[PDB]
mmCIF file of C-alpha atoms in Angstrom:
data_model
loop_
_atom_site.group_PDB
_atom_site.id
_atom_site.type_symbol
_atom_site.label_atom_id
_atom_site.label_comp_id
_atom_site.label_asym_id
_atom_site.label_seq_id
_atom_site.Cartn_x
_atom_site.Cartn_y
_atom_site.Cartn_z
ATOM 1 C CA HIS A 1 211.717 60.603 137.389
ATOM 2 C CA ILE A 2 211.242 61.671 133.749
ATOM 3 C CA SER A 3 214.000 60.886 131.241
ATOM 4 C CA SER A 4 216.018 63.444 129.296
ATOM 5 C CA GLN A 5 214.926 61.719 126.100
ATOM 6 C CA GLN A 6 211.282 62.305 127.022
ATOM 7 C CA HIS A 7 211.835 65.976 127.919
ATOM 8 C CA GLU A 8 213.576 66.556 124.599
ATOM 9 C CA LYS A 9 210.794 64.798 122.694
ATOM 10 C CA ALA A 10 208.044 66.790 124.399
ATOM 11 C CA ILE A 11 209.718 70.171 123.890
ATOM 12 C CA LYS A 12 210.447 69.298 120.268
ATOM 13 C CA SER A 13 206.766 68.440 119.739
ATOM 14 C CA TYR A 14 205.764 71.872 121.066
ATOM 15 C CA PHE A 15 207.615 73.450 118.143
ATOM 16 C CA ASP A 16 206.545 70.757 115.686
ATOM 17 C CA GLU A 17 202.867 71.269 116.518
ATOM 18 C CA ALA A 18 203.229 75.035 116.099
ATOM 19 C CA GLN A 19 204.567 74.161 112.656
ATOM 20 C CA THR A 20 207.671 76.300 112.954
ATOM 21 C CA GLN A 21 211.386 75.880 113.620
ATOM 22 C CA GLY A 22 212.889 77.024 116.889
ATOM 23 C CA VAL A 23 214.983 76.451 119.975
ATOM 24 C CA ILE A 24 214.684 77.207 123.696
ATOM 25 C CA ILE A 25 217.901 77.620 125.680
ATOM 26 C CA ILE A 26 217.599 77.127 129.449
ATOM 27 C CA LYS A 27 220.377 78.100 131.836
ATOM 28 C CA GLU A 28 220.652 76.496 135.269
ATOM 29 C CA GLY A 29 223.611 77.918 137.121
ATOM 30 C CA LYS A 30 226.377 77.946 134.532
ATOM 31 C CA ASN A 31 224.950 75.122 132.401
ATOM 32 C CA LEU A 32 223.178 75.787 129.099
ATOM 33 C CA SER A 33 220.584 73.336 127.807
ATOM 34 C CA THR A 34 219.244 73.450 124.273
ATOM 35 C CA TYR A 35 215.760 72.120 123.473
ATOM 36 C CA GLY A 36 213.447 72.362 120.482
ATOM 37 C CA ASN A 37 213.166 71.085 116.932
ATOM 38 C CA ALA A 38 216.029 73.101 115.382
ATOM 39 C CA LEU A 39 218.918 73.027 117.853
ATOM 40 C CA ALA A 40 221.367 74.491 115.318
ATOM 41 C CA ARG A 41 219.666 77.850 115.795
ATOM 42 C CA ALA A 42 221.327 78.164 119.226
ATOM 43 C CA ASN A 43 224.442 79.834 117.802
ATOM 44 C CA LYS A 44 223.061 81.617 114.753
ATOM 45 C CA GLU A 45 222.606 85.388 114.597
ATOM 46 C CA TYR A 46 219.223 87.109 114.311
ATOM 47 C CA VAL A 47 217.983 90.661 114.811
ATOM 48 C CA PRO A 48 216.972 91.150 118.470
ATOM 49 C CA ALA A 49 213.755 92.962 117.512
ATOM 50 C CA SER A 50 211.807 94.121 120.583
ATOM 51 C CA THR A 51 214.018 92.146 122.982
ATOM 52 C CA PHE A 52 216.375 95.078 122.511
ATOM 53 C CA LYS A 53 213.911 97.247 124.430
ATOM 54 C CA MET A 54 215.410 95.829 127.635
ATOM 55 C CA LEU A 55 218.826 97.272 126.786
ATOM 56 C CA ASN A 56 217.281 100.397 125.237
ATOM 57 C CA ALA A 57 215.555 100.993 128.594
ATOM 58 C CA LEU A 58 218.775 100.358 130.592
ATOM 59 C CA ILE A 59 220.723 102.819 128.441
ATOM 60 C CA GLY A 60 218.116 105.574 128.483
ATOM 61 C CA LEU A 61 217.612 105.331 132.236
ATOM 62 C CA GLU A 62 221.319 105.236 133.076
ATOM 63 C CA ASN A 63 222.112 108.237 130.913
ATOM 64 C CA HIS A 64 219.071 110.174 132.182
ATOM 65 C CA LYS A 65 217.195 110.305 128.887
ATOM 66 C CA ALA A 66 214.027 109.443 130.797
ATOM 67 C CA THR A 67 212.596 108.432 134.169
ATOM 68 C CA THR A 68 210.391 105.471 135.070
ATOM 69 C CA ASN A 69 207.396 107.759 135.627
ATOM 70 C CA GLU A 70 207.773 110.022 132.598
ATOM 71 C CA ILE A 71 204.728 109.898 130.322
ATOM 72 C CA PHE A 72 205.587 109.676 126.624
ATOM 73 C CA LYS A 73 202.735 111.461 124.886
ATOM 74 C CA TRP A 74 201.204 109.964 121.767
ATOM 75 C CA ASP A 75 201.845 112.480 118.979
ATOM 76 C CA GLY A 76 198.429 111.810 117.472
ATOM 77 C CA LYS A 77 199.705 110.078 114.345
ATOM 78 C CA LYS A 78 198.263 106.728 113.318
ATOM 79 C CA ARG A 79 200.236 103.846 114.742
ATOM 80 C CA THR A 80 200.296 100.179 113.754
ATOM 81 C CA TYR A 81 197.976 99.236 116.655
ATOM 82 C CA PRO A 82 195.231 101.194 118.497
ATOM 83 C CA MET A 83 196.721 100.105 121.822
ATOM 84 C CA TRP A 84 199.750 102.238 120.919
ATOM 85 C CA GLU A 85 197.754 105.418 120.274
ATOM 86 C CA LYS A 86 198.008 106.619 123.852
ATOM 87 C CA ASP A 87 200.321 108.256 126.359
ATOM 88 C CA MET A 88 202.490 105.790 128.250
ATOM 89 C CA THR A 89 205.460 105.189 130.515
ATOM 90 C CA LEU A 90 208.520 103.167 129.540
ATOM 91 C CA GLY A 91 207.027 100.286 131.524
ATOM 92 C CA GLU A 92 203.646 100.323 129.798
ATOM 93 C CA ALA A 93 205.438 100.656 126.458
ATOM 94 C CA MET A 94 207.542 97.609 127.363
ATOM 95 C CA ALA A 95 204.451 95.504 128.109
ATOM 96 C CA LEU A 96 202.781 96.680 124.899
ATOM 97 C CA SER A 97 206.076 96.602 123.020
ATOM 98 C CA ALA A 98 205.316 100.109 121.703
ATOM 99 C CA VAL A 99 208.174 100.715 119.262
ATOM 100 C CA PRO A 100 207.381 104.441 118.846
ATOM 101 C CA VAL A 101 208.137 105.121 122.502
ATOM 102 C CA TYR A 102 211.434 103.257 122.299
ATOM 103 C CA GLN A 103 212.375 104.892 119.014
ATOM 104 C CA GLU A 104 211.914 108.255 120.737
ATOM 105 C CA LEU A 105 214.061 107.065 123.643
ATOM 106 C CA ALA A 106 216.767 105.871 121.241
ATOM 107 C CA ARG A 107 216.754 109.242 119.484
ATOM 108 C CA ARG A 108 217.200 110.997 122.827
ATOM 109 C CA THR A 109 220.186 108.761 123.531
ATOM 110 C CA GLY A 110 221.576 109.491 120.074
ATOM 111 C CA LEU A 111 223.608 107.354 117.685
ATOM 112 C CA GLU A 112 226.983 108.100 119.279
ATOM 113 C CA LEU A 113 225.955 107.328 122.843
ATOM 114 C CA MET A 114 223.956 104.281 121.760
ATOM 115 C CA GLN A 115 226.835 102.759 119.792
ATOM 116 C CA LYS A 116 229.127 103.380 122.741
ATOM 117 C CA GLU A 117 226.716 101.814 125.232
ATOM 118 C CA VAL A 118 225.966 98.785 123.076
ATOM 119 C CA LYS A 119 229.717 98.274 122.673
ATOM 120 C CA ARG A 120 230.209 98.577 126.443
ATOM 121 C CA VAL A 121 227.590 95.994 127.471
ATOM 122 C CA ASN A 122 228.800 93.816 124.601
ATOM 123 C CA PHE A 123 225.336 93.032 123.183
ATOM 124 C CA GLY A 124 225.349 90.601 120.239
ATOM 125 C CA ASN A 125 227.616 91.672 117.373
ATOM 126 C CA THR A 126 227.475 95.158 118.941
ATOM 127 C CA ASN A 127 227.015 96.909 115.586
ATOM 128 C CA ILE A 128 224.158 99.408 115.215
ATOM 129 C CA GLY A 129 225.144 101.081 111.954
ATOM 130 C CA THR A 130 223.955 104.581 111.074
ATOM 131 C CA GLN A 131 220.198 104.515 111.858
ATOM 132 C CA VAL A 132 219.680 105.007 115.615
ATOM 133 C CA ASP A 133 215.944 104.288 115.456
ATOM 134 C CA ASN A 134 215.727 100.890 113.739
ATOM 135 C CA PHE A 135 219.039 99.032 114.025
ATOM 136 C CA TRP A 136 217.423 96.432 116.267
ATOM 137 C CA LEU A 137 214.595 95.870 113.785
ATOM 138 C CA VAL A 138 216.224 95.365 110.399
ATOM 139 C CA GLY A 139 219.907 95.106 111.191
ATOM 140 C CA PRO A 140 222.794 95.467 111.344
ATOM 141 C CA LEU A 141 222.487 94.476 115.018
ATOM 142 C CA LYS A 142 222.281 90.687 115.432
ATOM 143 C CA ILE A 143 222.522 88.354 118.415
ATOM 144 C CA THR A 144 222.369 84.604 119.033
ATOM 145 C CA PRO A 145 219.943 82.703 121.304
ATOM 146 C CA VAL A 146 222.932 81.780 123.481
ATOM 147 C CA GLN A 147 223.957 85.427 123.837
ATOM 148 C CA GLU A 148 220.354 86.299 124.714
ATOM 149 C CA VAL A 149 220.087 83.887 127.671
ATOM 150 C CA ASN A 150 223.456 85.117 128.884
ATOM 151 C CA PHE A 151 222.194 88.678 128.653
ATOM 152 C CA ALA A 152 219.057 87.602 130.496
ATOM 153 C CA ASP A 153 221.262 85.812 133.029
ATOM 154 C CA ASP A 154 223.300 88.947 133.645
ATOM 155 C CA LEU A 155 220.222 91.163 134.057
ATOM 156 C CA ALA A 156 218.431 88.746 136.381
ATOM 157 C CA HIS A 157 221.546 88.816 138.588
ATOM 158 C CA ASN A 158 222.212 92.544 138.191
ATOM 159 C CA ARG A 159 225.586 91.801 136.542
ATOM 160 C CA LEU A 160 225.254 94.158 133.588
ATOM 161 C CA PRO A 161 227.463 97.279 133.694
ATOM 162 C CA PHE A 162 224.709 99.613 134.941
ATOM 163 C CA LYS A 163 223.815 100.912 138.406
ATOM 164 C CA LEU A 164 221.896 98.441 140.555
ATOM 165 C CA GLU A 165 218.853 100.739 140.591
ATOM 166 C CA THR A 166 218.792 101.051 136.801
ATOM 167 C CA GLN A 167 218.657 97.257 136.418
ATOM 168 C CA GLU A 168 215.965 96.955 139.107
ATOM 169 C CA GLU A 169 213.895 99.653 137.426
ATOM 170 C CA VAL A 170 213.953 97.766 134.131
ATOM 171 C CA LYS A 171 213.383 94.342 135.672
ATOM 172 C CA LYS A 172 210.119 95.500 137.269
ATOM 173 C CA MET A 173 208.889 96.357 133.761
ATOM 174 C CA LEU A 174 209.287 92.751 132.587
ATOM 175 C CA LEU A 175 206.893 90.785 134.818
ATOM 176 C CA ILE A 176 204.547 88.940 132.448
ATOM 177 C CA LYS A 177 203.278 86.019 134.481
ATOM 178 C CA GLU A 178 202.955 84.407 137.886
ATOM 179 C CA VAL A 179 202.477 80.656 138.186
ATOM 180 C CA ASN A 180 202.417 78.687 141.443
ATOM 181 C CA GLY A 181 204.807 80.930 143.360
ATOM 182 C CA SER A 182 207.035 81.392 140.314
ATOM 183 C CA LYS A 183 207.367 84.724 138.516
ATOM 184 C CA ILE A 184 208.223 84.919 134.813
ATOM 185 C CA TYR A 185 210.144 88.035 133.730
ATOM 186 C CA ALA A 186 210.543 88.288 129.963
ATOM 187 C CA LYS A 187 210.511 90.407 126.832
ATOM 188 C CA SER A 188 209.007 89.138 123.601
ATOM 189 C CA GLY A 189 210.299 90.011 120.154
ATOM 190 C CA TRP A 190 209.166 89.638 116.553
ATOM 191 C CA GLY A 191 211.169 90.998 113.653
ATOM 192 C CA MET A 192 208.780 91.354 110.716
ATOM 193 C CA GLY A 193 211.092 93.583 108.697
ATOM 194 C CA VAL A 194 213.419 90.669 108.018
ATOM 195 C CA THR A 195 213.232 87.413 106.060
ATOM 196 C CA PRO A 196 212.668 84.929 107.381
ATOM 197 C CA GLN A 197 210.823 86.527 110.309
ATOM 198 C CA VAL A 198 212.156 85.810 113.788
ATOM 199 C CA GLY A 199 210.326 85.448 117.087
ATOM 200 C CA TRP A 200 211.739 85.764 120.599
ATOM 201 C CA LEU A 201 210.841 85.478 124.276
ATOM 202 C CA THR A 202 213.853 86.057 126.501
ATOM 203 C CA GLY A 203 213.935 86.349 130.261
ATOM 204 C CA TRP A 204 213.943 84.213 133.373
ATOM 205 C CA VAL A 205 211.755 82.525 135.945
ATOM 206 C CA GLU A 206 212.132 83.480 139.586
ATOM 207 C CA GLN A 207 211.082 80.511 141.692
ATOM 208 C CA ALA A 208 209.518 80.916 145.142
ATOM 209 C CA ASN A 209 212.778 79.864 146.812
ATOM 210 C CA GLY A 210 214.471 82.806 145.094
ATOM 211 C CA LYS A 211 216.415 80.830 142.483
ATOM 212 C CA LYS A 212 216.545 82.449 139.031
ATOM 213 C CA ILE A 213 216.458 80.401 135.825
ATOM 214 C CA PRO A 214 217.075 82.327 132.567
ATOM 215 C CA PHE A 215 215.814 81.165 129.183
ATOM 216 C CA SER A 216 215.570 82.247 125.563
ATOM 217 C CA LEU A 217 213.011 81.024 123.071
ATOM 218 C CA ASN A 218 213.861 81.692 119.433
ATOM 219 C CA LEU A 219 211.840 80.572 116.427
ATOM 220 C CA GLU A 220 210.808 81.490 112.897
ATOM 221 C CA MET A 221 207.537 83.412 112.649
ATOM 222 C CA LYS A 222 205.234 82.965 109.656
ATOM 223 C CA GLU A 223 202.495 85.271 108.371
ATOM 224 C CA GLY A 224 199.167 84.268 109.878
ATOM 225 C CA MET A 225 200.840 83.029 113.055
ATOM 226 C CA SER A 226 199.737 84.240 116.488
ATOM 227 C CA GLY A 227 202.365 86.002 118.593
ATOM 228 C CA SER A 228 201.207 84.158 121.700
ATOM 229 C CA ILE A 229 202.712 80.862 120.502
ATOM 230 C CA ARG A 230 206.027 82.249 121.738
ATOM 231 C CA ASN A 231 204.540 82.372 125.228
ATOM 232 C CA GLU A 232 202.610 79.100 124.963
ATOM 233 C CA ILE A 233 205.679 77.181 123.828
ATOM 234 C CA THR A 234 207.803 78.774 126.534
ATOM 235 C CA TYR A 235 205.360 77.958 129.344
ATOM 236 C CA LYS A 236 204.795 74.351 128.254
ATOM 237 C CA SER A 237 208.559 73.842 128.024
ATOM 238 C CA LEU A 238 209.235 75.474 131.377
ATOM 239 C CA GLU A 239 206.480 73.385 132.924
ATOM 240 C CA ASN A 240 207.529 70.154 131.242
ATOM 241 C CA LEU A 241 211.005 70.689 132.747
ATOM 242 C CA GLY A 242 209.499 71.485 136.141
ATOM 243 C CA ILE A 243 210.980 74.990 136.112
ATOM 244 C CA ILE A 244 207.559 76.500 136.851
#
């Protein structure tokens, strides 16, 4: 029906119109497809930012540093956003991307265990340095858009080296949208403590027929830019390709 040239032009325009540079890697089966207006970003390293929360959650749950029902109490100190000044579960913190909750979880895990677990799952360059509570925000941990879809691919198919239940627990925390029988599971990310700033939206679409299609949107964020563009560009691309 529609030509590859046309799909590539449309996706590229989604990034052009947002006035940013980015790429969206789609994985169908074992085949990777790169779309966007800056394809060379596919194999470049960037901090994972909040997308790391997926692995942070897997590690904490596997090593019993928390349960899926445990309420992390707000300590009462001012936080960057009012929505974060409340008591929440890992799952609510994932949806709100509440860094404080995941920094606490990382501290429970501890530097030694964290470095060992990141090495074991082979996430990005696997280096977390010496600060257990911010390595995914300002370095030294980095990962490429290609490694992100592959990580998303593994999780969606329960192939990561964690118990089946642990992966299922975390996957339930990532449902962000339902469209015509398709479910989108994803984690957004936005590293503001780095220059240039990087935006993410990694995950997968589960189609009605059960097929899972992983993706990874990666672009440069600019001050005065709405975080929802990550989602809007992802949805329009997924739709344009007929994925959802």
